[PDB]
Design a protein around this ligand. Structure first.
Ligand SMILES: C[C@H](CCC(=O)NCCC[N+](C)(C)C[C@H](O)CS(=O)(=O)O)[C@H]1CC[C@H]2[C@@H]3[C@H](O)C[C@@H]4C[C@H](O)CC[C@]4(C)[C@H]3C[C@H](O)[C@]12C
Ligand SMILES: Nc1ncnc2c1ncn2[C@@H]1O[C@H](COP(=O)(O)OP(=O)(O)O)[C@@H](O)[C@H]1O
Ligand SMILES: [Mg+2]
Ligand SMILES: [Zn+2]
Ligand SMILES: [Zn+2]
Ligand SMILES: [Zn+2]
Lengths: 75, 185, 396, 590, 186
RNA sequence: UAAUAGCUUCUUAGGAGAAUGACGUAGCAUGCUACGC
RNA sequence: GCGUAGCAUGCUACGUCAUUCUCCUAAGAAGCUA
């Protein structure tokens, strides 16, 4: 299960972004929604992984939103 | 069942069992049958209120558990979702996702959405020469498991800095962090 | 008096297989109250009738699906099953057909209402439902037409529209046939009198209306749920052009709905032992239950797994809080155990095993939060397949 | 309503009713606490009183869980079972509660009245959760001590500018100053309702108080006052975030030729960048709060929040930042009431500015890249937990010195508190040592520093100035008028007034005295800016007149006197009382 | 139950029965007192049934009364809210223009769709892209509904202010479309 | 912000009915015994 | 043979309680469909 692991990770990622009030910036939320919906409607795993990279770059670009070091040290 | 009314009913039942083991005749036998019935009825009323009380106990237990768990789960919704997201990210073990996450830990985060179209623009902040040495080889920039052509390096003063000025000796006087704009190759 | 009414447009937050947004129409209480008081007697009378064309109020449990499918196959001669699709059904429906449905529903008021009362009720229906003011994001727009999906009589008026389109397709199929090629002398005279009653008669001929209704019931048996329809038509008549086909529905929807009905969404089933291909999003399979063969509806396993995996609330993710949530899903997913594909049959067992795990960890957490187990626990019957097998048995 | 046990962080649903803060306690820990101390009330989701028609039993070993509620010994349903038994107290999560051995320090923390001195040295060397609980209950006790202050009333009003006061007979009288407020009553028949928020201050002549009010209601003689109460909020964050030593600077960036004045502290700036939190300890006037601004000039892009426990110290820091930092990107955050007059020269009350200065109590929840706490001596563990909770940060810097005066600690009245128990930061400074240490006085002249390197610091400080011979030590008896419950020394003020017209260059020297009463009443007779010793800390002035009001253990405190004298910049005249204190310093003749 | 004297009759009958049993009364008197106790307890439980019905119907009546009072004190609130909304909407009306267009009506009746279009003093234009903006309301003044409007404000989809110099062909990608322009009737 | 309608599962409460058992009272039928005629 | 009284057995009516079942309504949680 790798195609279906990507489609659920994108759901969780967009839930995190919505919790981080990315929804307030309409231009960014439109791109996040487009990437999420195109990951869900995907047949190829490489396209889904590229769109997952693009969608995770939204989370990684906001410095003050999440603590990457603390989150990645719990693993 | 370790209750008083059951003690009364049980001793009446034992007395009737002994009597019917004897069971000669007849009025004592019928009176003991009636005594057994009248004790059993009170024991049964006590058992019925016992069961009503324990049913309400189970109602209270279930309701309180539902309330406590619901409020606990609704309280911790951000941190739980973020931990779940990073657990799922680690489980995928994609090389591009791991690369961008490891760079984000060092502080080499992007400034915009990483683009998918060829010859598209990526702006990424590099906070020290360590993150520059691994990622940038010559004019090439390795990021997100992809190769990019470095176009424009600026500082926090927005001053253009040539790729020749990034070195072990001149950069310790520069205005770090650099911001590198590159194009997807 | 005519009361205009504003209807809100509400985005729908639900699980779906396509990424297009779905919107419902929240109609005002001033319209819903009066429409209930006007239509609810007939609407409850439709929902309480078993064995009719409009299957509303008929459950699919306890043999209700088998009964529906046996009523569709009502002594047709060369049965083929057929199902079509209405593209943009609620938004491309003409105002004339919505007014037709509202007037058909209002034919029951021949004693309680006067003529003016019925006209003003129709006018209120049109002003509040058909061509209204729409609140969409803090702004009032004008709705050009088409049914709104939030009025009191939505599914029933939709059923009237569906039946009307099917009858129109049959009329066009019978009239567009040659007439010199029709071998059956009864159908040739039926076509002649159909043309007479259409374009040479202005008063209703109730005898011929009954005759054509009998013809349609005999050769074009229908099953309608508001936009889903299963037909058990005579294949020989439809091949000879005496009864509507898929192409007739395509033509009728082209010139009377302003849509193109592609034949990729319309199915035909030549074998009745497989049942309808899809009705109300349920496939049908013929199983041996007890000692006799019955028709059971099974859903898409993707739908049930998606309902289990994705929820619309954060507290539906706990599992132990929502065991009835999975009991209902296992009730819906039970007929998959009779599917010949084992991966389909494993969904029901997956749900049963998850119910058992949920109860195990619920009892563990409860015993942790206290030091005593619950005295009365009747949850053991939810991971036994008999509780779900009895859900599709005709005894109730 | 569940929670976490204080001393073991297990799951629980019990609380101690008798404790002021009502802390969560697991089953084992709650049994250990109640079976040994005098606390015998336990609150579950429902309280553990006896549910008879009328019965009042709270002791937990007397009770049983009978039927469906908690019942006493002779009210129980005939079916038991005991609550406080089997080494535990019956509550939720009963079979997951791991106890501890800290139910010997928690008994002392809960029981103690914070009167002795050992209570503080046990409230600051315990475990991390007890460090928070002890601070919480200490603040609660300090608040509930105000409930024992005598109810006031009005005698009459000859002058509407100066109220007449009358305390209730048989109760102590609270001190009259700005820190304490009052709210009234009119209980005659006829309105037992508040009549406004007032405040008091004594008058020089007779018995009078020149009051102040939030409204303009008059008091018909029955109207009176009671001191209100400040409820104390709970606290969660640790006193000190655990330290991590980075290999290299993360989250901060150096600068290009920071300045020619801050070029000496560069190594300490890099050390600050390397570590998670740093401590700077130095004698007063050596460059501690001028280190923080230099740090700001060294990390220009870093958003910085400056904080302190006092107002007159953060005001001096604000003035220094205005002198050095760009004034456009500053702020100043003030409380809603703003009891003291704060600093109004920047864009006041804008939290999202780059450099933001605020008191600890008025800190808003925000983030930063380095937070600079200043004068940690004034701060208790409550202030440290508050600043660690509200302000998230990447780097923490605590600057301050233990030899200055500590927090008030009004409840403490027996023994003396050593520096190493002022709070966790001072304990860290004295135990292992500061991370940065700079001893060289750059502010005060040679004479005053050469005397203060004999009082408090054991001959450590060299310094840099020349003794201008404007350091004066006066001999004056100074008769006592214990007026406002803080002493007033009228003849010493008379000495000052009679020799402040003989000093043409001393017309602007700030007046410093340990007692707020004389310090406030001096404003009429000499007109100089006035300042108490406790709030003078952290601020420098070009000239200081210090007056030892009365001989006590408060005014003859070496820490207080050392933090008083070392605010001078070129000269200081001080009049003394103790024959020893005047002799330990070496000043001019008079 | 205990208030009614049926409990008193049961208690005195039981006391007499116990006293006579302890006193060794004869079998006939014992049966007589047993029968009297039985009928006393019968009356006691029979009236306790009426007491059960009394308390049950009293609680039902009290709950019904509470519900009715709540639904009558929630009706006045919504009545006042509807009245305030209607009167504020009255006060919003452009009375002079509406009076003109309604006096021009022959029957006094006008279509609703022309009420804003001829009397509204403020126009909100929602524009999805730059070509539409250039077409409909380029410049600080434009024409719509046979009237002249002057741009008073422009905001984006984020409700942030946008200046008319920022709405360009090259700055279009940097704007959060759609743009909502608010203009006033000139 | 969250529409109309249908079906189903689960839980709680109230009423009514049915069945079984228990007790008490009243009425009727029968057997035995004591007294009077 | 009759009347009165007592005991035992049986049937009916009424009242109370215990258990099980059915239904009618109300309230709440949830699932699916159009
Ligand atoms: C009698 C019953 C179980 C039977 C038993 O015999 N237990 C004996 C104890 C278990 N052993 C075996 C460890 C000993 C006991 C055990 C746990 C008790 C509940 C919770 O605490 C608290 C809860 C919240 C409020 O307070 C109101 C009451 C609640 C519902 C309590 C009700 C009742 O009182 C419970 C069910
Ligand atoms: N590098 C320096 N060169 C010259 N003077 C300095 C230097 N550093 C500090 N000072 C002077 O020393 C004084 C120290 O002030 P401050 O840091 O507030 O002391 P403290 O922190 O003890 O209150 C400042 O007023 C400043 O004028
Ligand atoms: Mg300082
Ligand atoms: Zn305690
Ligand atoms: Zn504990
Ligand atoms: Zn008691």
């Amino acid at each position: 299960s790798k195609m279906s692991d990507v489609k659920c990770t994108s759901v969780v990622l967009l839930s995190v972004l919505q919790q981080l009030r990315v929804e307030s910036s309409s231009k960014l939320w439109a791109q996040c929604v487009q990437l999420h919906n195109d990951i869900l409607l995907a047949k190829d795993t490489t396209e889904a992984f590229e769109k997952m990279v693009s969608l995770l770059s939204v989370l990684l670009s906001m410095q003050g939103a999440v603590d990457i070091n603390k989150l990645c040290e719990e693993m | 069942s370790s209750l008083p009314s059951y003690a009364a009913f049980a001793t009446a039942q034992e007395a009737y069992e002994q009597a019917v083991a004897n069971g000669d005749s007849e009025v004592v036998l019928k009176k003991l049958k009636k005594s057994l019935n009248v004790a059993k009825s009170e024991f049964d009323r006590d058992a019925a209120m016992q069961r009503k009380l324990e049913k309400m106990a189970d109602q209270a237990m279930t309701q309180m558990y539902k309330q406590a768990r619901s409020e606990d789960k609704r309280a911790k919704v951000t941190s739980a979702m973020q931990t779940m997201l990073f657990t799922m990210l680690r489980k995928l073990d994609n090389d591009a996702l791991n690369n961008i996450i490891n760079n984000a830990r060092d502080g080499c985060v992007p400034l915009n959405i990483i683009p998918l179209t060829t010859a598209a623009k990526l702006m990424v902040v590099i906070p020290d020469y360590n993150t520059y040495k691994n990622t940038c080889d010559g004019t090439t920039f390795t990021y997100a498991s992809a190769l990019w052509e470095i176009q424009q390096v600026v500082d926090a003063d927005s001053k253009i800095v040539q790729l020749s000025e990034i070195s072990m000796d001149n950069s310790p006087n520069l205005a770090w962090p650099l911001i590198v704009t590159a194009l997807r190759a | 008096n005519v009361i205009p009414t504003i209807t809100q447009m509400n985005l729908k937050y639900a699980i779906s297989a396509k990424n297009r947004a779905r919107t419902v129409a929240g109609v005002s209480i001033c319209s819903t109250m009066t429409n209930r008081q006007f239509h609810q007697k007939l609407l409850k009378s439709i929902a309480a009738t078993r064995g009719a064309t409009v299957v509303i109020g008929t459950s699919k449990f306890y043999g209700g699906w088998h009964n529906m499918l046996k009523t569709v196959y009502s002594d047709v001669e060369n049965p083929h099953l057929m199902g079509w699709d209405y593209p943009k059904c609620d938004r491309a429906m003409p105002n004339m057909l919505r007014i037709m449905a509202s007037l058909v529903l209002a034919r029951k008021h021949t004693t309680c209402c006067s003529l003016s009362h019925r006209f003003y009720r129709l006018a209120n229906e049109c002003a509040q439902v058909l061509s209204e003011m729409v609140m969409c994001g803090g702004s009032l727009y004008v709705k050009p037409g088409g049914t709104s999906s939030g009025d009191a009589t939505t599914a029933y008026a939709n059923s009237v529209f569906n039946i009307c389109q099917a009858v129109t397709a049959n009329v066009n199929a019978l009239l567009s046939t040659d007439g010199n090629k029709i071998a059956d002398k009864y159908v040739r005279n039926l076509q002649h009198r159909l043309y007479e009653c259409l374009y040479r008669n202005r008063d209703v001929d109730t005898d011929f209306v009954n005759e054509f209704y009998a013809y349609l019931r005999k050769h074009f048996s229908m099953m309608i749920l508001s936009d889903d329809a299963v037909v058990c038509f005579n294949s020989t008549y439809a091949s000879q052009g005496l009864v509507a086909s898929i192409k007739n529905f395509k033509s009728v929807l082209y010139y009377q709905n302003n849509v193109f009905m592609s034949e990729a969404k319309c199915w035909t089933e030549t074998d009745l032992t497989k049942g309808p291909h899809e009705f109300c999003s349920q496939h049908t399979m013929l199983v041996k239950q007890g000692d006799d063969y019955v028709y059971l509806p099974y859903p898409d396993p993707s739908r049930i797994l998606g309902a289990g995996c994705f929820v619309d609330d954060i507290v539906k993710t706990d599992g132990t809080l929502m065991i009835e949530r999975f009991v209902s899903l296992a009730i819906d997913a039970y007929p998959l155990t009779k599917h010949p594909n084992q991966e389909y049959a494993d969904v029901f067992h997956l749900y049963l095993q998850y119910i058992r795990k949920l109860h195990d960890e619920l009892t563990g957490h409860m015993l942790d939060m206290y030091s005593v187990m619950l005295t009365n626990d009747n949850t053991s019957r939810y991971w036994e397949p008999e509780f779900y097998e009895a859900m599709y048995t005709p005894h109730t | 309503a569940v929670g976490a046990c204080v001393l073991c962080n297990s799951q629980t649903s019990l609380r101690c009713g008798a404790c002021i803060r009502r802390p969560f306690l697991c089953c084992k820990c709650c049994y250990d606490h109640v079976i040994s101390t005098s606390h015998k009330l336990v609150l579950s989701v429902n309280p553990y009183v006896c549910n008879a028609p009328g019965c009042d039993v709270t002791d937990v070993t007397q009770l049983y869980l009978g039927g469906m509620s908690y019942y006493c010994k002779s009210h129980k349903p005939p079916i038991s079972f005991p609550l406080c038994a089997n080494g535990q107290v019956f509550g939720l999560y009963k079979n997951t509660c791991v106890g501890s051995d800290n139910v010997t320090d928690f008994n002392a923390i809960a029981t103690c009245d914070w009167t002795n001195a050992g209570d503080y040295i046990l409230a600051n060397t315990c475990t991390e959760r007890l460090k928070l609980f002890a601070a919480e209950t200490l603040k609660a006790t300090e608040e509930t001590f105000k409930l024992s202050y005598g109810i006031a009333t009005v005698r009459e009003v000859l002058s509407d500018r100066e109220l007449h006061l009358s305390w209730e007979v048989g109760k102590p009288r609270p001190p009259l100053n700005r820190n304490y407020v009052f709210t009234g009553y009119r209980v005659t028949k006829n309105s037992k309702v508040q009549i406004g928020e007032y405040t008091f201050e004594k008058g020089d002549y007779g018995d009078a108080v020149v009051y102040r009010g939030t409204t303009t209601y008059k008091l018909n003689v029955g109207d009176y006052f009671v001191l209100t109460s400040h409820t104390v909020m709970p606290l969660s964050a640790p006193t000190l975030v655990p330290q991590e030593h980075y290999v290299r600077i993360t989250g901060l960036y150096p600068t290009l030729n920071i300045s020619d004045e801050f070029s000496s502290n560069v190594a300490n700036y890099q050390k600050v960048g390397m570590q998670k939190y740093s401590t700077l300890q130095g004698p007063p006037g050596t460059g501690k709060s001028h280190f923080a601004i230099g740090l700001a000039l060294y990390y220009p892009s870093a958003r910085i929040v400056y904080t302190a426990c006092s107002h007159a110290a953060v005001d001096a820091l604000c003035e220094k930042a205005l002198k050095y930092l760009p004034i456009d990107k500053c702020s100043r955050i003030i409380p809603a009431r703003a009891r003291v007059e704060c600093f109004d020269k920047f864009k006041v009350n804008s939290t999202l500015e780059q450099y933001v200065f605020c008191t600890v109590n008025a800190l808003p929840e925000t983030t930063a890249d380095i937070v600079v706490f200043d004068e940690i001596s004034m701060a208790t563990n409550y202030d440290l937990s508050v600043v660690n909770a509200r302000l998230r940060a990447k780097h923490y810097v605590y600057i301050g010195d233990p030899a200055q005066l500590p927090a008030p600690r009004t409840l403490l009245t027996k023994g003396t508190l050593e520096p190493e128990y002022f709070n966790s930061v001072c304990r860290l400074m004295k135990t292992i040592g500061p991370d940065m240490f700079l001893g060289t006085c750059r502010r005060c002249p040679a004479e005053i520093v050469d005397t203060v390197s004999a009082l408090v610091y054991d001959n450590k400080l060299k310094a840099h100035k020349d003794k201008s011979a404007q350091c004066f030590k006066m001999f004056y008896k100074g008769v006592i008028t214990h007026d406002v419950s803080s002493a007033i020394n009228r003849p010493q003020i008379g000495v000052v007034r009679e020799f402040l017209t003989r000093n043409p260059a001393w017309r602007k020297a700030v007046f410093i005295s340990p007692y707020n009463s004389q310090n406030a009443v001096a404003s009429k007779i000499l007109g100089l800016p006035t300042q108490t010793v406790d709030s003078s800390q952290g601020s420098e002035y070009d000239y200081v007149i210090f007056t030892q009001t009365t001989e006590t253990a408060h005014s003859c405190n070496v820490n207080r006197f050392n933090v008083a004298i070392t605010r001078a910049k070129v000269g200081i005249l001080c009049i003394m009382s103790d024959r020893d204190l005047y002799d330990k310093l070496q000043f001019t003749s008079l």
